[PDB]
Enzyme design. Structure first.
Site, PDB file in Angstrom:
ATOM      1  N   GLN A 141     -43.151 -69.125  53.925  1.00 38.22           N
ATOM      2  CA  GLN A 141     -43.948 -67.944  53.582  1.00 38.22           C
ATOM      3  C   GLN A 141     -45.445 -68.242  53.714  1.00 38.22           C
ATOM      4  O   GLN A 141     -45.937 -69.215  53.144  1.00 38.22           O
ATOM      5  CB  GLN A 141     -43.592 -67.412  52.188  1.00 38.22           C
ATOM      6  CG  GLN A 141     -42.110 -67.011  52.064  1.00 38.22           C
ATOM      7  CD  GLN A 141     -41.798 -66.089  50.888  1.00 38.22           C
ATOM      8  OE1 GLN A 141     -40.752 -65.427  50.871  1.00 38.22           O
ATOM      9  NE2 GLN A 141     -42.690 -66.043  49.902  1.00 38.22           N
TER      10      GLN A 141
ATOM     11  N   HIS B   9     -42.350 -60.647  51.102  1.00 32.80           N
ATOM     12  CA  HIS B   9     -42.108 -61.022  49.702  1.00 32.80           C
ATOM     13  C   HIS B   9     -42.997 -60.253  48.722  1.00 32.80           C
ATOM     14  O   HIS B   9     -44.133 -60.650  48.443  1.00 32.80           O
ATOM     15  CB  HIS B   9     -42.237 -62.538  49.484  1.00 32.80           C
ATOM     16  CG  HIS B   9     -41.677 -63.008  48.170  1.00 32.80           C
ATOM     17  ND1 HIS B   9     -41.828 -64.291  47.704  1.00 32.80           N
ATOM     18  CD2 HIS B   9     -40.944 -62.345  47.234  1.00 32.80           C
ATOM     19  CE1 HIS B   9     -41.233 -64.406  46.525  1.00 32.80           C
ATOM     20  NE2 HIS B   9     -40.690 -63.245  46.220  1.00 32.80           N
TER      21      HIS B   9
HETATM   22  N1  LIG Z   1     -37.862 -61.767  45.159  1.00 36.42           N
HETATM   23  C1  LIG Z   1     -38.821 -62.199  44.138  1.00 36.42           C
HETATM   24  O1  LIG Z   1     -39.963 -61.698  44.004  1.00 36.42           O
HETATM   25  C2  LIG Z   1     -38.498 -63.267  43.113  1.00 36.42           C
HETATM   26  C3  LIG Z   1     -39.380 -63.366  42.075  1.00 36.42           C
HETATM   27  C4  LIG Z   1     -39.153 -64.283  41.100  1.00 36.42           C
HETATM   28  C5  LIG Z   1     -38.038 -65.114  41.162  1.00 36.42           C
HETATM   29  N2  LIG Z   1     -37.131 -65.030  42.168  1.00 36.42           N
HETATM   30  C6  LIG Z   1     -36.035 -65.914  42.204  1.00 36.42           C
HETATM   31  O2  LIG Z   1     -34.838 -65.567  41.354  1.00 36.42           O
HETATM   32  C7  LIG Z   1     -34.504 -66.865  40.717  1.00 36.42           C
HETATM   33  C8  LIG Z   1     -33.847 -66.674  39.419  1.00 36.42           C
HETATM   34  O3  LIG Z   1     -34.702 -65.948  38.561  1.00 36.42           O
HETATM   35  P1  LIG Z   1     -34.293 -65.790  37.035  1.00 36.42           P
HETATM   36  O4  LIG Z   1     -35.452 -65.149  36.322  1.00 36.42           O
HETATM   37  O5  LIG Z   1     -33.009 -65.009  36.861  1.00 36.42           O
HETATM   38  O6  LIG Z   1     -34.142 -67.278  36.515  1.00 36.42           O
HETATM   39  P2  LIG Z   1     -33.074 -67.818  35.479  1.00 36.42           P
HETATM   40  O7  LIG Z   1     -33.417 -69.261  35.198  1.00 36.42           O
HETATM   41  O8  LIG Z   1     -33.034 -66.978  34.232  1.00 36.42           O
HETATM   42  O9  LIG Z   1     -31.641 -67.731  36.109  1.00 36.42           O
HETATM   43  C9  LIG Z   1     -31.180 -68.735  36.957  1.00 36.42           C
HETATM   44  C10 LIG Z   1     -29.726 -68.782  36.833  1.00 36.42           C
HETATM   45  O10 LIG Z   1     -29.158 -69.468  38.006  1.00 36.42           O
HETATM   46  C11 LIG Z   1     -28.150 -70.322  37.402  1.00 36.42           C
HETATM   47  N3  LIG Z   1     -27.822 -71.385  38.271  1.00 36.42           N
HETATM   48  C12 LIG Z   1     -28.417 -72.600  38.367  1.00 36.42           C
HETATM   49  N4  LIG Z   1     -27.817 -73.320  39.312  1.00 36.42           N
HETATM   50  C13 LIG Z   1     -26.826 -72.588  39.866  1.00 36.42           C
HETATM   51  C14 LIG Z   1     -25.886 -72.811  40.872  1.00 36.42           C
HETATM   52  N5  LIG Z   1     -25.873 -74.061  41.547  1.00 36.42           N
HETATM   53  N6  LIG Z   1     -25.007 -71.859  41.198  1.00 36.42           N
HETATM   54  C15 LIG Z   1     -24.992 -70.655  40.571  1.00 36.42           C
HETATM   55  N7  LIG Z   1     -25.892 -70.399  39.577  1.00 36.42           N
HETATM   56  C16 LIG Z   1     -26.809 -71.339  39.216  1.00 36.42           C
HETATM   57  C17 LIG Z   1     -28.791 -70.757  36.175  1.00 36.42           C
HETATM   58  O11 LIG Z   1     -27.856 -71.380  35.302  1.00 36.42           O
HETATM   59  C18 LIG Z   1     -29.340 -69.540  35.645  1.00 36.42           C
HETATM   60  O12 LIG Z   1     -28.388 -68.792  34.867  1.00 36.42           O
HETATM   61  C19 LIG Z   1     -35.779 -67.556  40.579  1.00 36.42           C
HETATM   62  O13 LIG Z   1     -35.623 -68.969  40.470  1.00 36.42           O
HETATM   63  C20 LIG Z   1     -36.485 -67.225  41.783  1.00 36.42           C
HETATM   64  O14 LIG Z   1     -36.155 -68.163  42.809  1.00 36.42           O
HETATM   65  C21 LIG Z   1     -37.373 -64.102  43.175  1.00 36.42           C
END
Ligand SMILES: NC(=O)c1ccc[n+]([C@@H]2O[C@H](COP(=O)([O-])OP(=O)(O)OC[C@H]3O[C@@H](n4cnc5c(N)ncnc54)[C@H](O)[C@@H]3O)[C@@H](O)[C@H]2O)c1
Ligand SMILES: NC(=O)c1ccc[n+]([C@@H]2O[C@H](COP(=O)([O-])OP(=O)(O)OC[C@H]3O[C@@H](n4cnc5c(N)ncnc54)[C@H](O)[C@@H]3O)[C@@H](O)[C@H]2O)c1
Lengths: 384, 384
Positions: free
Chosen positions: B313, B332
């Site tokens: 990105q 994004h």
């Molecule tokens: N499109 C966007 O603008 C944007 C913005 C922010 C975050 N995100 C992404 O979404 C992700 C998650 O966000 P969140 O707030 O829900 O975080 P979060 O920490 O609350 O949720 C992450 C979840 O993934 C689970 N997890 C970890 N490893 C795993 C695996 N190997 N297989 C399956 N599940 C697994 C975790 O246990 C947890 O429940 C962020 O890390 C980020 O990469 C995207």
């Protein structure tokens, strides 16, 4: 009998299309308890394209085996169209809202044999109901057949407008990134006030889908909903569209088109909203004033408008809703998703089976019967 | 102290943009009970564009009044960038996932004064966490700040893909109608099997929004979510993505990017899905194998893919996800809605206040601290 059936043209690529998947989900009941259509048989596989000329709503073998004639055409405009030429001796006329064979008073007068005007889909406003009443014509449609389709399309459009999806996708396609340009008009739906005009079959389906987005919900209605529905969803009721307009960031229209709803959303109502509000209309175009919608978008009074319904249909190439600012339009497609077509094609057959066997058409399918509004028509429409 | 802050460029039209509306909803709390950020003050009106160079995340006066230096730039690529030039004596670095200042092990080695790497937004995979752990750098982000934004974006994209919104909008803009062309690939979401990868903050938000669409809900995670959650939503758990792929029509990815999840969605997983399935990825691009996604769409193995995340990105102008068939991409942008920006900008300031005042950064904001995964990083991430 002679059945005259108007459908839209086949896909550009040819018929049948190359289907993306080989099956669709099985739907048995609508959310209010109404059962999906129950024809004796269907002569198609759910998921097939049925609403175009070659698709024929899957009706040909059924009709011709009974000795009826079945004429299918897309040609529907003016006195020299196949439709109008074949009209004078048609016992039954079928068309879809997406490509509607308008039954104006003048056309109904020419239709000397017409006894059943059957909508393939939902919404029979392309029929002059006053003229059908006077002529003693039965008007029916497949209630709820594609209502959930519309509800999904509406919620999708609400999200796309508020989040600024469509111009941002164009930037991705064009090779840009330009986050600031993407998000300068991008908001979350969360916490906004969102209202539906009507809480009928589609209106309630939309309210239910909006609830977990943590918006504050409003509605207006011809007839106020039960206390249990208001409590389930946290609804605030308003006696008029104008009142609701004052308090909502987003409004989605879900009433039928008839004289009391024609141009309901004109400048007077639009101007009651707070600058930069959003309006979605997947009901009928003429519930809105066409040019006032354009004016509201040009001034920013509306930050966005989206819908799949137009007037007339098909919309001319130069229809002003096509390229007005900040729009999320599609052609009229929501209720003609392949999933929806399976249900309304089945319902069209069910209704015909009843009609030909001298059995009742389902009360919920009726709009006009025996010289008056009847069934759902009596509950949802007006003719004043 | 020296704060080096990388933000995206101003709007093409100039700064400030012409805002569609003057105010946004007030959010007090997140769905799990976590409070929104609590800095002592904010130097902006919620609703303003903050994530670009002129917006400054609203930080300049706060920092400069305290005698800190604040360098803001969008120039982030290569060793000749303003970012890499200013890096060697920066005490704090801030950037957003949408325009990320990558902290490679090589860059961290050059960063002789770096003690705090602060993400403005959610997701810190643009920092080499192993190298951060080695160097004793604290890594933090504003947990939940824009999670609902992403959930809305993901559900919007699911609907757009299944319903065939984007090509149909193009037809409306171009002067067409062509219902058969629009609906030849249009389906309802109703009744489909939909699964999320993870049911964390965003994943659960997505599952809750999907529920009233009457889909059958699935998820995969390392461990099951609480019984209360599974019961609320009617969830079916799967131990692996492969297992979930076998039974879902639509999957939406919501896991963090670290070694265990990198290229999780490659041909092996994709080929377990039924032909014509859909995939949405608003998590991180590298959870997918980039070219396997392209080929799946070309062959029809996937009927559609959409997401707002890319690698790298910004995505180069020739990045294959831009023009691959049947995509619903945006740049994004989801987490940088003006609504989200207000929260993560407030949280960025809150974290800076704690840091400068020698008070703990909220445990839920921590990813790396004291030479190890900590807080949310310890619960959600891994370092392989
Ligand atoms: N499109 C966007 O603008 C944007 C913005 C922010 C975050 N995100 C992404 O979404 C992700 C998650 O966000 P969140 O707030 O829900 O975080 P979060 O920490 O609350 O949720 C992450 C979840 O993934 C689970 N997890 C970890 N490893 C795993 C695996 N190997 N297989 C399956 N599940 C697994 C975790 O246990 C947890 O429940 C962020 O890390 C980020 O990469 C995207
Ligand atoms: N894709 C399509 O073509 C498509 C498909 C389905 C429905 N529609 C349109 O949506 C309309 C509604 O569909 P439905 O299934 O919910 O029908 P419905 O009869 O169940 O609900 C309509 C509701 O609108 C209410 N209403 C009537 N006049 C009103 C007014 N002046 N103000 C506020 N509310 C009013 C009625 O009381 C009724 O509850 C249809 O009439 C149709 O025009 C279009």
């Amino acid at each position: 009998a002679k059945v005259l059936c108007v459908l839209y043209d086949d896909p550009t690529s040819g018929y049948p299309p190359l289907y993306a998947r080989n099956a669709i989900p099985k739907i048995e009941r609508y959310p209010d308890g109404q059962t999906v259509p129950n024809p004796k048989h269907i002569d198609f596989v759910p998921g097939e394209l049925l609403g175009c000329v070659s698709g024929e709503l899957g009706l040909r073998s059924y009709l011709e085996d009974l000795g009826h004639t079945f004429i299918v055409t897309s040609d529907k405009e003016g006195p020299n169209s196949v439709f109008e030429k074949e009209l004078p001796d048609a016992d039954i006329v079928i068309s879809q809202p997406f490509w509607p064979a308008y039954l104006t008073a003048e056309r109904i007068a020419k239709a000397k044999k017409l006894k059943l005007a059957l909508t393939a889909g939902i919404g029979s406003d392309h029929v002059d109901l006053n003229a059908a009443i006077k002529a003693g014509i039965t008007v029916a449609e497949e209630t709820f057949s594609n209502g959930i389709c519309v509800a999904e399309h509406a919620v999708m459009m609400i999200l796309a407008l508020v989040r600024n999806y469509l111009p941002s996708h164009k930037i991705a396609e064009e090779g840009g990134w330009n986050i600031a340009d993407c998000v300068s008009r991008s908001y979350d739906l969360e916490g906004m006030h969102v209202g539906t005009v009507a809480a009928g079959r589609i209106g309630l389906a939309v309210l239910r889908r909006l609830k977990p987005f943590d918006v504050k919900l409003h509605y207006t209605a011809r007839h106020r909903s039960p206390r249990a529905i208001e409590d389930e969803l946290g609804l605030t009721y308003h006696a008029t569209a104008e009142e609701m307009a004052e308090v909502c960031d987003v409004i989605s229209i879900h009433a039928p088109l008839y004289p009391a709803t024609e141009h309901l959303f004109n400048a007077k109502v639009l101007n009651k909203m707070r600058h930069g509000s959003y309006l979605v209309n997947t009901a009928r175009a003429e519930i809105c004033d066409r040019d006032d919608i354009v004016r509201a978008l040009e001034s920013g009074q509306l930050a966005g408008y989206a819908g799949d319904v137009w007037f007339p249909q098909p919309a001319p190439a130069n229809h002003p809703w096509r390229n007005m600012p900040h729009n999320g339009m599609t052609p009229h497609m929501s209720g003609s998703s392949l999933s929806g077509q399976a249900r309304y094609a089945a319902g069209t057959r069910e209704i015909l089976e009843c009609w030909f066997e001298n059995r009742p058409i389902r009360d919920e399918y009726l709009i006009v019967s025996n010289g008056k509004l009847a069934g759902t028509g009596a509950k949802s429409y007006g003719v004043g």
